[PDB]
Design an enzyme around this catalytic site. Structure first.
Site, PDB file in Angstrom:
ATOM      1  N   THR A 197       0.774  -1.349   0.132  1.00 46.86           N
ATOM      2  CA  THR A 197      -0.056   0.111  -0.013  1.00 46.86           C
ATOM      3  C   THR A 197       0.816   1.110  -0.115  1.00 46.86           C
ATOM      4  O   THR A 197       1.899   1.398   0.704  1.00 46.86           O
ATOM      5  CB  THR A 197      -0.927   0.096   1.400  1.00 46.86           C
ATOM      6  OG1 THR A 197      -1.732  -0.947   1.341  1.00 46.86           O
ATOM      7  CG2 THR A 197      -1.877   1.217   1.281  1.00 46.86           C
ATOM      8  N   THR A 198       0.373   2.342  -0.654  1.00 45.81           N
ATOM      9  CA  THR A 198       1.031   3.488  -0.369  1.00 45.81           C
ATOM     10  C   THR A 198      -0.163   4.560  -0.491  1.00 45.81           C
ATOM     11  O   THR A 198      -1.156   4.358  -0.841  1.00 45.81           O
ATOM     12  CB  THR A 198       1.910   4.089  -1.473  1.00 45.81           C
ATOM     13  OG1 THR A 198       3.086   2.881  -1.645  1.00 45.81           O
ATOM     14  CG2 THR A 198       2.653   5.233  -1.291  1.00 45.81           C
ATOM     15  N   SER A 219       3.603   0.396   3.247  1.00 48.39           N
ATOM     16  CA  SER A 219       4.706  -0.243   2.618  1.00 48.39           C
ATOM     17  C   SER A 219       5.646   0.554   1.662  1.00 48.39           C
ATOM     18  O   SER A 219       6.678   0.618   1.821  1.00 48.39           O
ATOM     19  CB  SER A 219       4.286  -1.576   2.107  1.00 48.39           C
ATOM     20  OG  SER A 219       3.082  -1.036   1.056  1.00 48.39           O
TER      21      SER A 219
END
Lengths: 204, 200, 219, 218, 206, 228, 123, 209, 228, 206
Positions: free
Chosen positions: B1-2, B130
């Protein structure tokens, strides 16, 4: 897992006096991507292609051992090794290391220059061969490759239709895999020619 | 994920990706990681998907009751507090969350981070997930207070894009939202592979 | 895996199924589990494939020197014994499990070898994950001085119990028949799982996949 | 921890057979060789289980009581299907409290000329079918009953008995914690009946079992 | 990953940089350890990791290369051979009794024609390596906790045709980003450049 | 397993059940646990079959060599000592309980127990294997010295059968062998002629009353056999 | 525990307990509030001037928070209880929402405390 | 003793402009064995437009199916006899799975049905209830190969509208391939086609080994 | 422990050894494992003494209450069921193996086994405790139905003695009690009058020849008794 | 111990200081969190530890003190009572279900006469506390990894009669020593002073 640390996938399919072998281009450290230009294919001679996946230090070291033994074979024997002997040899080396293994899983694809018969092998990391007639695959998206090939592959195909099957497979499977990707490289081999192609893919 | 967010002169930008990855297999490329809580507040979602969606839906149910009871809209301070207090009370129960909350109330733009332990921090620039460790690289070079809205949407898009390019568990479509005085506005969605060709 | 053996009036029948798996996926549907040891001795293998392959090969090579040296026919007992010594030494780390069958001057011989190195000579055996199912066909159906045909029908039925009831076994029956004078492999003796819905053919017209770059090499 | 071994069952034309042995073990000790393991539950239904005999006693007591009380207080006679459903709910509930019924049940019966047979395992998994088993029955028996039922039009009572006995004989040969002493219940014509114990004929005299051929050292 | 290293290759050079810090648990012992070790006249290696593995490792490389140069009349070894040698030793140690060197390396060289007979492509090469023996040529690369931030900036800003002055600016910004966002303090960087004329320290990059 | 050996005047008898098991499932129902070590010396094997096959084979190899050198038949004590030493040197790596018994002209019939840990004890009878713990009391109560060969074979067959009827881990055939100055005599009894089983013992014929019918009395009578 | 129903309807929609509570308010000392532009004025009557009463008299106008006052009329002890609940409520709110409670909100809290006491058995 | 068993097998669904097609295999697996080749618990109808489809542990899917069946009966009683739409049941189901956050259903579920405009939809869930509406979905033992194949044939992202019939053939092909390679998937497939008219069903044989 | 109960026509006999142990050391050599539950119902306790004392006391408390209510003597099945339930509800928290036996006019003499885990089985005899595993074969071989009270007391005394001679964890006195329509009869036999021990059994009098003298012959004869 | 706090008491004041840093693992989220929380007009508390325990804890102190001041006509509570209250809550939480607050505190107050009747000794008091509920009056005290370095400097340099200007210099030097020797980066300090006239920020101390 250690076999999935570095990323990568390889696939080989047979047709009618041809094969195709494909690999993805990603090198990683778990989720961090180091390079997007590391194909995993090694050309042994005019007839044999080697794919290696698993941990990259052991891919690098085990392919150098294969290259070393092959060079000595060629000087002693004054000939090129055939697909089947090369695979038996590879197997022997993996099992030499049975209680402390090379973390590699090879995919060998070959063609008998005379008879035009295609030999495929894949190995576990201690060298157990799996030699079917359709295809073989290995690495982090091997589960998702199986079903692509069962549904696209069919006996008989010639170089150009075998190449599409094998590129659609690798792409659709790499796209559900976080550790393999960045498009692909494919070798297409007949008795007469060896074509290589870099295939576009996603940039994640 | 960002996910990232930051505050500038014209408001706030939020941007996300849309991938959901066990760790090897990719389950989706089409998650909506920005949560339209209502029409003046946004959440973002990182970490556990079920956790973030249940608790931001709960948050949204409290923002609505507040506004029925009091005839007025809850502040961004209080919204983030309702959510920080739920996470705090569940601190020992294994939730996984890394949220931003963003709004424009009477004291202006506010951006908060709130996490699974009960942290709640207010600040002008955040990135979570992440791929945060790559987004900040691009975001710290380009960020300043006086960006235009177009320049700031480009900065956020380029930042998420660079994370998707290098992080295994980020990918998919990049979505940018703008929080302005009038509420918020979804600005764009672009597949990260199509962005690759724009930026090369 | 399901491997089976029986003794009959004039020899031995070995049987096997043909599925090899990695995990919970079929890697090869038509793998060959009946291995050559000598002109008059074959082996079926279960356990870890690499280990089963390495030990059978090794003992088959050592039996071949022994026949050149002695100029005599290999005895089934000699194989059994080289097998067990090797597995004993490695304390079951080499995790081969084998049915061994042959015929030599003392008549038919059939034995199992477990991975820790224990042997058992018996008139009927099974091994592998479908050993239980298989073994239930053998105890209801074995009798003494079976003919070749009855033996083949019993082995095939025993393998089919594995195929349909154990998930790690599948596809078809291979038999091998060993007699004083010849050894006869019978790949696909029974194919109880042929196709029903003929596969939908899915086509890609060449030029379906976008290529960035191409190189050619004439051989 | 008195525990029961394998149970098996098969449907035939007109009814269903359930069979087991009469032994409770404690670990490897054969402790009681004369226990009747099958229990009649109501008018149409019969149950048995592999596993912990105390957990079977407790669960069948609870069930037999619901069934008898319901009938006596005006709510009619529960059917196999209903009994089965109630069993599976209680197995499941207990699993959900982490206090499982460490048994695997087989249930059989006959109502409206329709024979029932189904299984319930200790986490609550349930299924019905033409042949069910528990214990080493599932590995040893089912391959034979399933082969037997392949024939089209189904099994007569007598062919169902023959194949039940062949399975019994293999259990006796290959299951450690067993004995050669078995009962069969037969659900048919809307009632169950339990037979007297019997024994199966076994074979021990093959030439390949003789002393010289099985000798490790000549 | 307490020590960030950085490197990238441009048309006619490689810049390499490494953080000065040496620490004992939370205590800073010193912040000026040079970790960018020169291996020969046109090679450097930036190593990350503990003093002991790091020193023993690069001293072993240096001495074996030095021994290869007298058993060969002072002929300079190619960068790709030095990397292949480094890789074989990392890999070897990993399956040895004493176990792996826990060092992560960046090897940078500029290859220059031995004689006139020599057909070698002359220019800069960078190699990433890891303590396992992974090795890969790259246009830029990093190790340590600051690595991700810098890798993304360089994906964003690096080009092949940067001038020496632009590439120092870019190296400087990458060091600032590490300071700004990594909690471990990498307060001082030493930065060296590898060119056709050899190894030289870059003073304006701190 | 249930193994045993018994001395009689002039010889020994060895007896064993025939079962090899993985715990719950029988992998061989017709093993041969009476292994030959020399013409008149045998052992009874219990424990890991892999281990006791390898140690018996090794002990037999040594004794055949020794008999060629000496040119004489070998005494039981020699067999027992060779084995014992193998069982002691490997005690941490094996699971083995052995009985060596035999006839030799110098000392007649003799029996050695060599249990786990590798001790070696010289007895008038020895019991071994999992099924042994059911026979101590049997022998204490029913065994006598002075038995002839025929009494001793019969007694061994009846002991094994008592053991294997209660031990889940024993069963199958009963093999015996009798060793004395004359020729070795082996016997195998099939389970269908076993001298004892609980299945045929009349005190276990009638079933326990676990399943009485729903009744209007606390009196207990019979198991319910048919639905109401 | 005492659970009797105290406040109940009677034959014309009258809740007498509530009425008589409002009688008690009518006997209590007078209080006044007046809202200006930017000031509020609370003014109350005290019992009666005595020599003995303490010059620093007890206050009959209470602070609920930094920006909210209360004056009352009626049973002074009941009111002290009510003021306690309201002081708790304001601080509870700071803790749950960080911001300071609005007057209009605090009024509905208090008013609902009064309403509940007209329906809660036992009281 | 774990409270958890995985009984195996596979489900798959595909939507189009006014229909959805839903498939589940009929094997029920034990430990190294097969309980039966004819379990039909994987698919469960909730209204005439909405199905639940589940894999994982069968005892859990039977509980969840009953809890849903009674929340749905309660909705009707509290709502004037009306049934909740597919979108509502999907939101209901997520809500309920989350609520066992702390001891979860071992289930991979799909709610599949028509939307309010008459079009198909599929909601795939994780075990604690995060989902989205999608045009296709699959879960269970063979799902990691069925899913790239559907990605390939339906979206065609690496290349240069279907009938009910073409779609039913694609799924039939996808289960046939799953049974060949996934050892826990086999025997038959039960297919339900959902249209506004109603529900058509069709069994379909697969490998028995 | 070694406990047991046996039915005879008209009644039961209960028997037990008298030892309580910590494993290796005897903390009480004269326990009383035959516990009274009602005038003609007793139980034999094995396992944790703390647990089985608390469950017997509790079972006895319930039965005395029930007999006052009903005004009738209580049947054995009632004792057995009450106990069983206590043993089942607490199965994870205790170590208990129980035998309930008794006489009542409706069903005569009855014996219930209630082993660990809390099952309850109605038998003609029951064995329990660590020493039980030595008596299965004894009973299979030597027990008969139809025994009188006197035969059954004597048989129980002889079974206990066989058990406790081989079980390290049993020993001491042998207590019995006989329950029937007449008055309860208890008996205690001291170890010095035990009907069996290995110390007095003539086949164990002569010692094994483990310690032969250093000799010039392989012949084995006697243990060395005096220094050379 | 990633966040250093510092405090010392001089004749007519207390200085308190705390490091701005807020971190997520190795990443610096921000370096300007004010952790020196004012509790009342003449009190502050510097807390060390995670955001969540730290905020919840000091908000609970603030609200209970605020509630004690209206139930008492705005009368200021003594520093030693605020400390006793804080201590009882740390100690209570430590034996509770939800477990301890993982915060370490320094409480600083200046006590000032309520009325004329009031006999109280008027001046500055500092209290050290720990997450267990240890509490001790002290002339100076610290928490976090920088604590040992600073404690020794202050043993060396602190006197009671420092002027306000000398005590800012000393506070500045203690912050520099933390930066120089602690590997975790405590790059920015916020420093407040507690005097007879109240709480005031000290701007020259960074």
């Amino acid at each position: 897992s250690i076999l999935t640390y570095s990323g990568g996938s390889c696939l080989a399919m047979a047709g009618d006096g041809c094969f195709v072998i494909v690999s993805d281009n990603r090198l990683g450290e778990q989720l961090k991507t180091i390079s997007m230009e590391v194909p995993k294919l090694h050309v042994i001679n005019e007839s044999i292609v080697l794919g290696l996946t698993g941990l990259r230090t052991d891919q690098q070291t085990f392919s150098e051992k294969v290259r070393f033994r092959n060079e000595l074979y060629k000087l002693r024997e004054e000939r090129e090794i055939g697909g089947k002997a090369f695979a038996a040899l590879v197997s022997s080396m993996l099992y030499e290391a049975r209680f402390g293994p090379w973390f590699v899983e090879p995919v060998i694809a070959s063609i008998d220059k005379r008879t035009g018969e295609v030999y495929l092998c894949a190995m576990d990391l201690i060298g157990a061969p799996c030699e079917p007639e359709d295809y073989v695959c290995a690495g982090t998206c091997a589960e998702s490759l199986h079903g692509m090939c069962e549904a696209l592959w069919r006996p008989g195909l010639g170089p150009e239709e075998l190449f599409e099957v094998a590129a659609q497979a690798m792409l659709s499977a790499c796209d559900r895999d976080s550790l393999s990707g960045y498009g692909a490289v494919a070798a297409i081999v007949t008795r007469d020619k060896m074509t290589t192609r870099l295939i576009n893919g996603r940039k994640d | 994920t960002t996910t990232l967010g930051f505050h500038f002169d014209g408001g706030i930008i939020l941007a996300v990706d849309s991938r959901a990855s066990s760790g090897q297999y990719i389950s989706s490329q089409t998650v909506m990681k920005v949560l339209e809580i209502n029409e003046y507040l946004l959440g973002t979602m990182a970490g556990g998907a079920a956790d973030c969606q249940y608790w931001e839906r709960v948050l949204g149910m409290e923002c609505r009751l507040w506004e029925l009871r009091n005839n007025c809209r809850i502040s961004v301070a209080a919204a983030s507090k309702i959510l920080a207090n739920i996470t705090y009370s569940y601190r020992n129960y294994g939730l996984s969350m890394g949220t931003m909350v963003a709004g424009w109330d009477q004291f202006g733009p506010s951006l908060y981070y709130v996490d699974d332990k009960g942290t709640r921090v207010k600040h002008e620039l955040f990135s979570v997930g992440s791929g945060s460790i790559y987004a900040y690289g691009v975001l710290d070079q380009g960020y300043r207070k006086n960006l235009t809205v177009e320049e700031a949407c480009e900065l956020a898009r380029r930042s998420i894009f660079h994370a998707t390019y290098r992080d295994g568990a980020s990918g998919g479509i990049v979505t940018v939202y703008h929080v302005h005085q009038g509420g918020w506005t979804q600005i764009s969605r672009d597949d990260q592979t199509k962005l690759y060709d724009r930026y090369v | 895996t399901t491997i089976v053996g029986v003794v009959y009036k004039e020899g031995v029948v070995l049987g096997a199924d043909t599925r090899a798996t990695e995990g919970s996926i079929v890697a090869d549907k038509r793998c060959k589990k009946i291995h050559y040891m000598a002109p008059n001795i074959m082996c079926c293998g279960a356990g870890t494939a690499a280990d089963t392959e390495a030990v059978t090969n090794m003992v088959s090579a050592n039996l071949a020197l022994h026949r050149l040296d002695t100029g005599k026919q290999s005895r089934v007992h000699e194989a059994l014994t080289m097998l067990k010594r090797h597995l004993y030494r490695y304390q079951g780390h080499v995790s081969a499990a084998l049915v061994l069958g042959g015929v030599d001057v003392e008549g038919p011989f059939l034995a199992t070898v477990a991975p820790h190195g224990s042997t058992d000579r018996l008139p009927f055996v099974s091994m592998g994950s479908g050993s239980i199912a298989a073994m239930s066909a053998l105890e209801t159906g074995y009798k003494e001085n079976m003919t070749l045909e009855e033996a083949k029908e019993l082995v095939a039925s025993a393998i089919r119990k594995g195929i349909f009831n154990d998930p790690y076994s599948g596809t078809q029956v291979d038999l091998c028949v060993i007699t004083k004078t010849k050894t006869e492999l019978l790949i696909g003796y029974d194919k109880p799982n042929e196709r029903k819905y003929p596969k939908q053919e899915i086509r890609f017209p060449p030029g379906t996949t976008p290529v960035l770059r191409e190189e050619i090499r004439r051989l | 921890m008195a525990s029961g071994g394998s149970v098996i069952g098969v449907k035939y034309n007109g009814g269903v057979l359930l069979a087991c042995d009469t032994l409770l073990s404690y670990g490897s000790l054969a402790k009681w060789p004369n226990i009747p393991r099958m229990k009649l539950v109501g008018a149409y239904t019969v149950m048995c289980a592999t596993g912990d005999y105390a957990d079977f006693q407790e669960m069948t007591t609870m069930i037999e009581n619901h069934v008898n009380r319901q009938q006596m207080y005006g709510g009619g006679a529960l059917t196999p299907n209903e009994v089965f459903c109630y069993l599976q709910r209680h197995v499941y509930h207990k699993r959900s409290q982490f206090e499982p019924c460490l048994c695997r049940f087989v249930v059989a019966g006959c109502h409206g000329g329709e024979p029932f047979l189904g299984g319930v395992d200790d986490v609550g998994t349930r299924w019905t079918d033409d042949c069910v088993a528990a214990g080493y029955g599932a590995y040893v028996a089912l391959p034979l009953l399933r082969q037997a039922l392949e024939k089209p039009g189904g099994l007569t009572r007598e062919e169902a008995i023959r194949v039940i006995k062949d399975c019994l004989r293999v259990l006796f040969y290959r299951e450690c914690r067993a004995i050669n002493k078995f009962q069969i219940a037969d659900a048919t014509s809307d009632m169950v009946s339990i037979g007297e114990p019997f024994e199966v004929e076994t074979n021990w005299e093959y030439d390949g079992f003789c002393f010289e051929k099985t000798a490790i050292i000549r | 990953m307490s020590e960030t290293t950085i490197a990238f290759r441009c048309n006619g050079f490689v810049l390499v940089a490494a953080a000065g810090l040496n620490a004992f648990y939370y205590i800073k012992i010193m912040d000026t350890e040079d970790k960018v070790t020169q291996l020969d006249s046109h090679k450097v290696v930036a190593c990350a990791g503990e003093n002991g593995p790091r020193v023993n490792f690069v001293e072993y490389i240096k001495c074996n290369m030095a021994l290869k140069r007298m058993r060969e009349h002072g002929r300079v070894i190619r960068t790709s051979a030095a990397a292949s040698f480094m890789r074989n030793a990392l890999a070897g140690a990993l399956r040895s009794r004493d176990g792996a060197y826990l060092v992560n390396c960046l090897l940078a060289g500029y290859d220059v024609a031995a004689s006139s007979d020599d057909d070698i492509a002359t220019g800069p090469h960078l190699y990433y390596m890891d303590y396992l023996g992974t090795m890969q040529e790259v246009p830029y690369g990093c190790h340590g906790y600051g690595a991700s931030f810098v890798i993304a900036m360089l994906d964003r800003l690096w080009r092949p045709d940067l001038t020496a002055q632009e590439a120092v600016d870019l190296m400087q910004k990458c060091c600032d980003e590490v300071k700004k966002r990594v909690v471990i303090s990498n307060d001082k960087f030493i930065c060296k450049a590898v060119t056709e004329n050899g190894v030289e320290i870059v003073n304006t990059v701190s | 397993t249930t193994i045993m050996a018994v001395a009689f005047k002039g010889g020994v008898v060895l007896a064993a059940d025939s079962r090899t098991s993985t715990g719950t499932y029988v992998v061989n129902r017709a093993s041969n646990k009476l292994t030959k070590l020399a013409e008149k010396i045998y052992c009874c094997r219990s424990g890991s079959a892999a281990d006791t096959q390898a140690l018996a084979e090794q002990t037999a190899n040594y004794l055949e060599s020794y008999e060629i050198d000496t040119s004489k038949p070998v005494n039981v004590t020699t067999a027992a000592n060779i084995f014992k030493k193998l069982c002691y040197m490997n005690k941490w790596n094996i699971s083995a309980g052995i009985i060596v018994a035999g006839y030799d002209p110098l000392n007649g019939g003799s029996v050695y127990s060599i249990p786990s840990g590798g001790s070696c004890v010289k007895l008038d009878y020895a019991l071994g294997g999992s099924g042994s713990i059911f026979l101590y009391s049997f022998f204490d109560a029913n065994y006598k010295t002075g038995m002839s060969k025929e009494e001793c074979v019969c007694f061994c067959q009846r002991a094994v059968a008592h053991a294997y009827s209660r031990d889940g881990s024993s069963g199958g055939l009963i093999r015996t062998i009798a060793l004395h100055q004359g020729e070795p005599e082996d016997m195998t009894i099939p389970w269908t002629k076993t001298p004892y089983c609980m299945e045929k013992d009349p005190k276990y014929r009638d079933l326990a009353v676990q399943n009485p019918p729903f009744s209007s009395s606390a009196k207990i009578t019979v198991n319910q056999s048919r639905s109401e | 525990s005492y659970d009797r129903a105290i406040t109940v309807f009677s034959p014309d929609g009258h809740l007498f307990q509530v009425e008589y509570a409002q009688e008690a308010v009518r006997k209590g000392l007078c209080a006044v509030g007046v809202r200006g532009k930017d000031s509020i004025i609370f003014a109350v009557e005290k019992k009666s001037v005595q020599k003995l009463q303490d010059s620093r008299t007890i206050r009959k106008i209470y602070k609920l928070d930094e920006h909210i006052y209360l004056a009352f009329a009626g049973l002074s002890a009941d009111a002290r209880v009510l003021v306690n609940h309201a002081q708790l409520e304001c601080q509870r709110f700071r803790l749950n929402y960080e911001d300071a409670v609005d007057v209009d909100l605090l009024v509905r809290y208090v008013a609902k405390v009064q309403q509940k006491s007209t329906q809660s058995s036992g009281s | 003793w774990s409270p958890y068993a995985d009984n195996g097998g596979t489900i798959a669904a595909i939507a189009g402009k006014n229909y959805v097609i839903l498939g589940g295999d009929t094997r029920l697996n034990g430990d190294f064995c097969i309980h039966t080749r004819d379990d039909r618990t994987k698919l469960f109808q909730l209204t005439e437009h909405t199905f639940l489809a589940s894999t994982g542990m069968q005892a859990d899917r039977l509980q969840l199916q009953q809890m849903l069946k009674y929340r749905i009966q309660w909705y009707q009683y509290n709502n004037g006899g009306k049934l909740p739409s597919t979108k509502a049941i999907a939101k209901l189901t997520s809500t309920m799975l989350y609520q066992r956050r702390f001891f979860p259903y071992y289930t991979f579920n799909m709610v599949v049905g028509l939307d309010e405009k008459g079009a198909g939809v599929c909601y795939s869930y994780d075990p604690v209830g995060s989902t989205e509406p999608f045009r296709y979905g699959t879960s269970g033992s063979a799902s990691s190969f069925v899913e790239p194949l559907m990605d390939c044939l339906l979206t065609r992202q690496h290349m240069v509208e279907l009938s009910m019939t073409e779609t039913l053939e694609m799924l039939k092909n996808a289960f046939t391939g799953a049974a060949e390679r996934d050892i826990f998937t086999g025997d038959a497939v039960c297919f339900h086609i959902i249209t506004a008219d109603g529900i058509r069903s069709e069994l379909f044989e697969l490998r028995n080994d």
